[PDB]
Amino acid sequence: QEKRKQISVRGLAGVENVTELKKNFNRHLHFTLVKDRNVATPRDYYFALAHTVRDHLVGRWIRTQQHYYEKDPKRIYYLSLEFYMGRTLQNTMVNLALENACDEATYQLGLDMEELEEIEEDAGLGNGGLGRLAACFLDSMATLGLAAYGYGIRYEFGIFNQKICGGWQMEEADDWLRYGNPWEKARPEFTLPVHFYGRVEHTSQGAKWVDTQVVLAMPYDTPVPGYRNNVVNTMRLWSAKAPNDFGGYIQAVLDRNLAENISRVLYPNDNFFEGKELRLKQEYFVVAATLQDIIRRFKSSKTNFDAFPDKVAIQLNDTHPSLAIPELMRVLVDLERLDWDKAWEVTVKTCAYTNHTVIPEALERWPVHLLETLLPRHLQIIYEINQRFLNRVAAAFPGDVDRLRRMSLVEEGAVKRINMAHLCIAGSHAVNGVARIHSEILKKTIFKDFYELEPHKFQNKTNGITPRRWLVLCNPGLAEIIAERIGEEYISDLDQLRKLLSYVDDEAFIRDVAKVKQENKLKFAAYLEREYKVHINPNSLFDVQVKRIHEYKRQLLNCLHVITLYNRIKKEPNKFVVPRTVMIGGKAAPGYHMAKMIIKLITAIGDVVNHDPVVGDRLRVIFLENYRVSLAEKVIPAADLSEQISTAGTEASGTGNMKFMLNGALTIGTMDGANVEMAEEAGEENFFIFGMRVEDVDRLDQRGYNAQEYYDRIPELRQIIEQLSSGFFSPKQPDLFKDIVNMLMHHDRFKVFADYEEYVKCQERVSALYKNPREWTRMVIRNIATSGKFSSDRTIAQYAREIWGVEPSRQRLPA
Amino acid sequence: QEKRKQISVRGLAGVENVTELKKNFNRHLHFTLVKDRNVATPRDYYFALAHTVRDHLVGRWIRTQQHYYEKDPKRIYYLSLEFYMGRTLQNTMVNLALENACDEATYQLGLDMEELEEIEEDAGLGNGGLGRLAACFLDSMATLGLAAYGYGIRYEFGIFNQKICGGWQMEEADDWLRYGNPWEKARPEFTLPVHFYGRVEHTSQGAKWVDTQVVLAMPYDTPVPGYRNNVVNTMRLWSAKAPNDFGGYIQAVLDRNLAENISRVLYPNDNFFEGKELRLKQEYFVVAATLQDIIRRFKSSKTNFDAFPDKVAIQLNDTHPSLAIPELMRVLVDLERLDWDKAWEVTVKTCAYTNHTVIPEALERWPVHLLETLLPRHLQIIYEINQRFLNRVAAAFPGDVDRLRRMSLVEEGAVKRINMAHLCIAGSHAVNGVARIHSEILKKTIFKDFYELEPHKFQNKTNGITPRRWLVLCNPGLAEIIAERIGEEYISDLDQLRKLLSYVDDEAFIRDVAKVKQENKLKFAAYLEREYKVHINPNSLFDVQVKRIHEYKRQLLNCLHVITLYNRIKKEPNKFVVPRTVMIGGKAAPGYHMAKMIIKLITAIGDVVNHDPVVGDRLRVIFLENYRVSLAEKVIPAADLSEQISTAGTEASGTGNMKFMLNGALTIGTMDGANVEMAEEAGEENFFIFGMRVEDVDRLDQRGYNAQEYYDRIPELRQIIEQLSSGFFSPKQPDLFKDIVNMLMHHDRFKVFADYEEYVKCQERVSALYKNPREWTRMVIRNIATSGKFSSDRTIAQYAREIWGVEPSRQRLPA
């Protein structure tokens, strides 16, 4: 489009720069791709552009790392099993101010850059919120000029590709590397050994871990560009490789696959501990290889380890990399020969832990037998940490034996386990939750005893999202109308969006916000038509619930509301209702039966609603296939209503909530997670808040939740449960949804029925405001304008100042 | 060295070319390797040079393939399970006339190009002679301007790396891709499906192969440059990939490894049929994917398949790709719907078979049950081919039922099998052996009945070696002294070496041939000192036997001679003997017990001989570790004496024999394989020929070989067998060599003792000539001068004119 090249936030199309981009495009098509224009495909053109853009990172990548060596700042190591990065081409162009130049160069070559961008595979190396937070954090750490290093695993297969077949989720391997990854640099020369199994000999000058099996860790380094500051940081992802030296010869070569399976595939558990040995091996793999780099780089700076916490921070993204605590102790004591007490002082000052969930089934609780077999020296070190930690508890709280049992790292029972959260708190100088309400409940309840011992350890760091990917990349139209009024500083100073409150009565700004939303809705409809031949009514409210499928996130409550809308149309067909397209998307864990039944229920509801001639285009319910970072970038800018309807107390923070608020959707939600802070920033009058608060959920727990009472008192709810039970939504298999009904009626931990009446009433208010386009858009302006707190730049600045002890800077490196 | 840059055969160091090479080297170090001079290692510098040199192939690679599309010549498909390519950097520089320019550019950058060349991994995708012949053939087909396509498998692990530990072979995985392969281009867009298992439904319009398991074949294309003719051909190697769509989800992802194991590792059997299913899958994998390319490219030329054999040749390197015969029939009949008779006419005119061995245990004889399960439609087609073929036999030779049983493709017994050689002869218009003596024995004996049916099918194509890798690359000093007298035309017209017979009395040429040998000996000694801290006496005759370890190649006969030399020194210590360094190298198949015992015997003989103070430096025996193409390039130019001592009738051709003759070694050998033709070309007076001829071996077989008779009649032999038996060469384990003694005395198929006396006497004559350096060197000149027949250019010109029906050309493509 000619239109999109006039977007000033996308930079300058300099004549020499355009000429050079075309030259290098053609150079890569020839020398790199070994193609000519006769045979070249759109994929070949995508790769020629990707190589051309990647070359623009290299000088800044080398100079940035040279700068950190020379200036010797404190280094931040961000350890995560997940980095949900998405696509890289657009993000690179945005951060280097190359987007308009590349759009013009490709146009001059007879190509549409947006078609080329759709060829790129997502780097889907995460499940959901935690993994995407790691990705936004890498972006903000580079934008803030921090000497920050993301460390994780290079999964051969990321989160599975979801296909919907006969209304059911099917899973296929996410072969994201099939055509190569042009962004990464393989570093085989920097391969390190990781040890497993073996035994401890206690001997010579102390303990020695012997007779181990080795797996090599081969690093792949990916550039992480800051926003227009010439900073390019590194994400290092480890790949498993069989060791150099060793059923017979052929079988021994094939059996190299077993070690190499450590990095083969992302475990698709979101919020659930499965306890597989292979997952424990992945966790140790990342920790062991990463801490070897940390120690080596420390020793090569400007051995005495008193200075180690002044030069190193290790941030633990959940408990997944918790083995960093005993691994650091193992290296410092067994290899560097530090006294235990000195080693422990260093470890606690180096490490900090971010907690992401309250749900008990999420908590990592590894059997001691498994740790004994796989990591015998680490289990010895965990026991020693536990003895010394509980000695501190016993001294602070003399005779409180109940408190000792509650705080122990060792959990008793038929299977003895290590509570990895307790290990992280003991071994960390800072423990944070991820929204105000969550961090408070860690202090008040979940970790109350630990808070009472060491109150100074407990912090809050409300989550955030990067306004590069989640505004400038995905919604250039909105980014442009904002920049037209307040300039471009807001892109790395998002609190400047508050200036937009000056425009709540500005006719041109009201017109333009609505125009941009409508453009985004047309573009999303065009995507569904092009990729799926699915039609949506463009004259409908786009009601969107996208996130992983879980009982706690209550996609089932949304289902009850969609059926309510359907039954109310059938009862009073002549009554006008605001037309809606209700879109639900997200992946279910392959083993999570209830979540897979919920996906089938959503499609089955569509099979009735979307074909009923009385309804026609007044209501449609669609299941958005294969929800992932690139799809979020398409649907979130199109959304009118953001569904954030978790049971109060269950969602620690959320981040999709923030993405919707930044992109001009109004929110319907509970007072849960960061929704509380979003409502505070915008004013509750600008949010559709409904349902039980935490205190109400707790009062129901005290007397007992009886779903039958709700069924007995609410006729419209009874009608729906009877439709589900009798086969109205599965006439070929009338008992198909029996397990959902049984769960709702008798075993619902998430109290769906208890929020049904307030939710339906709140949804009526949504429809009432949508009937007034001017007031809808003015309320949207009040939301976009107060979204600034939810920048991950704010979040990272707080981590830097309050945990890591480093001062952020938006100052440019030279060219 | 300044010296080596004055070698005119290595081309011009043009000022602009040197400037451009340095610029692009530095460009690749920055943009490709993401390194600076501060961190760069010798490996990084090797890769910067490799990328710089590879870029010089690309324009010619694209133009060559465009030229074949435009001119539409007949295409030659060379199918092999092995391509023993060696290293690529030097070969590329030689063939593009870039060697002196690259040597000067690297020198100006403060680097030694020869040190950089030693960093490159061999592409060790073969076992020995057959695989190396495929590699020399790709080089000669490009030099002769043929539209030739090599097709094979991209093994992740080639022939195992051999370590010698306590005197024994140990095997390690050959991880040749650890640091990447800069020469290949991955072509994931050209991935094709290969089918396995399933069943035949006979139905609709005929047979259909259904319910199969799919493995994808992903091609990697490697350039194959001709010698200074601007021709760059392609070697396409297929890599196994699991199919797009599918113990649970995690196990299903891990289980992708099973399909991917098809291309994991080269079977290290040289001359032995093991019958593993995985090997049959590799063979079908190559054939199925390759023939899909052949059919698609035929259809896109300038469907009627009458023209198919005018546009396609398929050359079968041994029986390994024999399934090409029934696969072509399957495609033509089941997919293209040709009449059987028409399909068979086309298949026989397209296919030709090269036989490489006479040893019965080498012959591929697949169980029918295995073929039925894995390839049910192919087994049906093989049975139909067999019925129609035997009907022809029965018509030509009425009532010769014995002949029908002998010629059948089906072998009867406790396990019914398919004789793949018989399938290849039935389905090929040409069958060739690989030296005159071998091709004659195919007609006279091995395939006598097939010869009697179709005499016109049987041909000879004496093997050859490329004089690029095996003279100009590996022995630039010799190449230069030759070019000083006869110019450079001989490099792709090797019969011009006959002009050197004019120099047998030329004092300067005699001086220079000896000088070059001595330089090569110093360089090889320096290699053993640098890499192994092994000293060799530079004032010794270098007696070299390098080839795979087999009983038929009689490394054991060489052992008997080394012990003879040792015992004769001990008996008469004051008697002068020509000092020797006896070098033996080669790999044993991991399952071949006798070959592994022979390696241990060679090292054990060294353990005594090399430490005996009476012997000191008069005799040394060393086992050259990890013999492979790059080591051949080092040791062969250093050799004085070439050991080619197979039992008469056992070595079909040989090619190492040829390499030694071209590089200035004299040969000691039997009248076996190509040794017969080498002696004919040079004159038998210039060869150390000894031992039984084939007719003598056959006469011993008729009366029975009794090793005891030799033992009883030859005291020096009895002394050695008693030393082996009593533990003289294994004092810590006196019975260690019992199995070798038992085999020699009672079960020796290769008649070692029957050639012992003639071999020792012949070796005396070698020593007598070595005492006369002038006459030694004059005999060497007579050998180098008559080595021209053994160019693979001669071999390929014969394949082209006599089998493929194409005329070779040494004419240049434009720049």
What phi, psi does B315 have (nearest 5°)?
A: -100, 120
What phi, psi does B608 have (nearest 5°)?
A: -85, -55
CB contact under 8 A, B31 and A58: yes
Q: DSSP character for A469?
A: I
Q: How many CB atoms sit inside 10 A of residue B266's CB? A: 25
| Cβ pair B16, B40 in contact under 8 A | no
CB contact under 8 A, B43 and A245: no
First to last CA, chain A: 32
How many CA atoms does the CB half-sphere of A802 hold within 13 Å?
16
| Cβ pair A183, A230 in contact under 8 A | no
A245 close contact with B: CB closer than 8 A: yes
In the numeric block, the tokens 């000519």 are attached to A36
The 3-class secondary structure across A32-59, one letter per residue, is: HCCCCCCCCCHHHHHHHHHHHHHHHHHH
Resolution at which this structure was determined, Å: 1.5
Mutation target vs B (from A31, A55, A174, A253; most B CBs, 10 A cutoff): A253
User: What are the boundaries of each domain within chain A?
Assistant: 539-783
Tokens of A407: 């705080």
Alpha-carbon span B429 to B351, nearest angstrom = 6
For the stretch A306-343, what's the b/e string if a residue is b when 16 or more beta carbons lie within 10 angstroms of its beta carbon? eebbebbbbbbbbbbbbbbbbbbbbbbbbebebeeeeb
Tell me which residues of chain A, numbers 32 to 51, contact chain B at a CB-CB cutoff of 8 Å. 34, 36, 41, 43-44
Q: In chain A, what's the furthest Cα-to-Cα distance?
A: 89
| Cβ pair A424, A353 in contact under 8 A | yes
Can you say whether residue A200 is alpha, beta or left, with left for phi > 0 and alpha for psi between -120 and 50 degrees?
Answer: beta
| Cβ pair A260, A218 in contact under 8 A | no
The residue type found at A56 is H
CB contact under 8 A, A188 and B171: no
Displacement of CA B254 from its chain's centroid (Å)? 35
B157 close contact with A: CB closer than 8 A: yes
Tokens of A577: 């209702």
- Residue A673's contacts (CB-CB under 8 Å, 6 or more residues apart) are A435, A437, A438, A646, A651, A652, A653, A654, A657
The 3-class secondary structure across A510-555, one letter per residue, is: HHHHHHHHHHHHHHHHHHHHHHHCCCCCCCCEEEEEECCCCCCCCH
Alpha-carbon span A784 to A509, nearest angstrom = 12
- Residue B282's contacts (CB-CB under 8 Å, 6 or more residues apart) are B81, B153, B262, B263, B267
For the stretch B588-615, what's the b/e string if a residue is b when 16 or more beta carbons lie within 10 angstroms of its beta carbon? bbbebeebbbbbbbbbbbbebbbeeeeb
Angle at B491 between CA B488 and CA B494, to 5 degrees: 115
For the stretch A382-419, what's the b/e string if a residue is b when 16 or more beta carbons lie within 10 angstroms of its beta carbon? beebbeebbeebeeebeeeeebbeebbbbbeeeeebbb
In the numeric block, the tokens 């004259």 are attached to A539
| Cβ pair A262, A218 in contact under 8 A | no
Task: Pinpoint the alpha helices (H) of A351-467.
Answer: 368-374, 376-396, 401-407, 420-426, 436-441, 448-453
> DSSP characters for B43-84?
HHHHHHHHHHHHHHHHHHHHHHHHHHHHH-PPEEEEE-S-EE
- Residue A707's contacts (CB-CB under 8 Å, 6 or more residues apart) are A744, A745, A746, A748, A752, A753
The CATH architecture that domain B72-87+122-464+798-804 belongs to is 3-Layer(aba) Sandwich (3.40)
Residues of chain A with Cβ-Cβ distance to B61 below 8 Å are 34
**Radius of gyration for chain B, computed over Cα atoms and rounded to the nearest angstrom:** 27
Tokens of A606: 């569509």
Q: How many CB atoms sit inside 10 A of residue B758's CB? A: 14
Alpha-carbon span B51 to B180, nearest angstrom = 12
Long-range pairs for B341-347 at CB < 8 Å and ≥24 separation? Answer: B342/B305, B342/B306, B343/B305, B344/B385, B344/B388, B346/B305, B346/B306, B346/B308, B346/B309, B347/B427
Cα distances from B627 to residues A312, A462, B117, B505, B624, in angstroms, run 48, 63, 18, 36, 7
B249 close contact with A: CB closer than 8 A: yes
A573 close contact with B: CB closer than 8 A: no
CB-nearest to A256 from B173, B276, B591 is B173
Name the E strands within A645-736: 666-669, 688-689
CA-based nearest residue to A286, from A461, A88, A149, A159: A149
How many CA atoms does the CB half-sphere of A261 hold within 13 Å?
20
**CATH for A539-783, among 3.30.470.20, 3.40.50.2000, 3.10.20.340, 3.30.70.580?**
3.40.50.2000
Helix, strand, or coil here: B314? strand
Cα distances from B641 to residues A530, A546, A777, B584, B665, in angstroms, run 73, 77, 93, 12, 5
| Cβ pair A594, A740 in contact under 8 A | yes
Displacement of CA B660 from its chain's centroid (Å)? 15
Q: DSSP character for B282?
A: H
CB contact under 8 A, A253 and B244: no
Q: DSSP character for A331?
A: I
For the stretch A191-220, what's the b/e string if a residue is b when 16 or more beta carbons lie within 10 angstroms of its beta carbon? bbebbbebeeeeeeeebebeebebbbbbbb
For the stretch A683-713, what's the b/e string if a residue is b when 16 or more beta carbons lie within 10 angstroms of its beta carbon? eeebbbbbbbbbebbeeeeeeebebeebbee
Can you say whether residue A654 is alpha, beta or left, with left for phi > 0 and alpha for psi between -120 and 50 degrees?
Answer: left
Name the E strands within B485-576: 541-546
| Cβ pair B276, B374 in contact under 8 A | no
What torsion, rounded to 10 degrees, do the Cα atoms B680, B682, B685, B689 define? Answer: -60
Alpha-carbon span B770 to B776, nearest angstrom = 6
The residue type found at B504 is V
With residues binned 3-state (H G I as helix, E B as strand, rest as coil), the percentages for chain A, rounded to 5, are 55, 15, 30
Alpha-carbon span B230 to A117, nearest angstrom = 37
**Radius of gyration for chain A, computed over Cα atoms and rounded to the nearest angstrom:** 27
The helix (run of H) or strand (run of E) holding residue A241 is strand A232-241
Alpha-carbon span B725 to B710, nearest angstrom = 16
Residues of chain A with Cβ-Cβ distance to B160 below 8 Å are 249
CA-based nearest residue to B380, from B208, B193, B205: B208
- Residue A682's contacts (CB-CB under 8 Å, 6 or more residues apart) are A661, A782, A783, A786, A787
CA-based nearest residue to A586, from A169, A229, A266, A208: A169
Bridge-based pairing state of the strands A148-153 and A75-79: parallel
Alpha-carbon span A584 to A604, nearest angstrom = 13
Q: DSSP character for A483?
A: H
Q: DSSP character for A176?
A: T
A301 assigned to a ligand binding site: yes
CA-based nearest residue to B749, from B498, B587, B554: B554
B12 close contact with A: CB closer than 8 A: no
Alpha-carbon span A140 to A124, nearest angstrom = 19
Alpha-carbon span B527 to B544, nearest angstrom = 16
B185 close contact with A: CB closer than 8 A: yes
CA-based nearest residue to B769, from B636, B667, B670: B667
Q: How many CB atoms sit inside 10 A of residue A39's CB? A: 13
Helix, strand, or coil here: A192? strand
Bridge-based pairing state of the strands A161-165 and A168-172: antiparallel
**CATH for B468-788, among 2.30.30.790, 3.90.550.10, 3.80.10.10, 3.40.50.2000?**
3.40.50.2000
CA-based nearest residue to B622, from B533, B692, B684: B533
The helix (run of H) or strand (run of E) holding residue A287 is helix A277-299
The helix (run of H) or strand (run of E) holding residue B106 is helix B99-108
Alpha-carbon span B151 to B139, nearest angstrom = 14
Alpha-carbon span A155 to A278, nearest angstrom = 13
> DSSP characters for A87-112?
--HHHHHHHTT-HHHHHHHHHHTT--
CB-nearest to B61 from A34, A180, A254 is A34
Alpha-carbon span B538 to A244, nearest angstrom = 35
CA-based nearest residue to A716, from A598, A606, A604, A563: A563
What phi, psi does B427 have (nearest 5°)?
A: -100, 15
Alpha-carbon span B681 to A89, nearest angstrom = 64
Mutation target vs A (from B253, B267, B269, B596; most A CBs, 10 A cutoff): B253
Q: Sort B535 into a burial class: Cβ within 10 Å, 0-12 / 13-18 / 19+.
A: middle
Residue of B nearest to A266 (CA): B250
CB contact under 8 A, A178 and B160: no
**For this structure, is A356 an active site residue?**
yes
For the stretch A644-666, what's the b/e string if a residue is b when 16 or more beta carbons lie within 10 angstroms of its beta carbon? bbbbbbbbbbbbbbbbbbbbbbb
- Residue B1's contacts (CB-CB under 8 Å, 6 or more residues apart) are none
Alpha-carbon span B311 to B306, nearest angstrom = 10
Which residues share a beta bridge with A459? A432
- Residue A511's contacts (CB-CB under 8 Å, 6 or more residues apart) are none
Distance from CA of B33 to the nearest CA of A (A): 8
Helix A507-532 with A773-784: angle, nearest 10 deg: 90
Angle at B505 between CA B502 and CA B510, to 5 degrees: 100
Alpha-carbon span A609 to A553, nearest angstrom = 23
The residue type found at B84 is Y
What phi, psi does B752 have (nearest 5°)?
A: -55, -50
| Cβ pair B195, B288 in contact under 8 A | yes
CB contact under 8 A, B590 and A249: yes
Alpha-carbon span B431 to B802, nearest angstrom = 11
Helix, strand, or coil here: B396? helix
Q: Do domains B72-87+122-464+798-804 and B468-788 have the same CATH topology?
A: yes
Bridge-based pairing state of the strands B619-624 and B641-644: unpaired
Technique used = X-ray
What phi, psi does A648 have (nearest 5°)?
A: -50, 130
Residues of chain B with Cβ-Cβ distance to A175 below 8 Å are 244
Cα distances from A567 to residues A206, B22, B168, B286, in angstroms, run 74, 76, 82, 61
| Cβ pair A775, A504 in contact under 8 A | no
| Cβ pair A589, A270 in contact under 8 A | yes
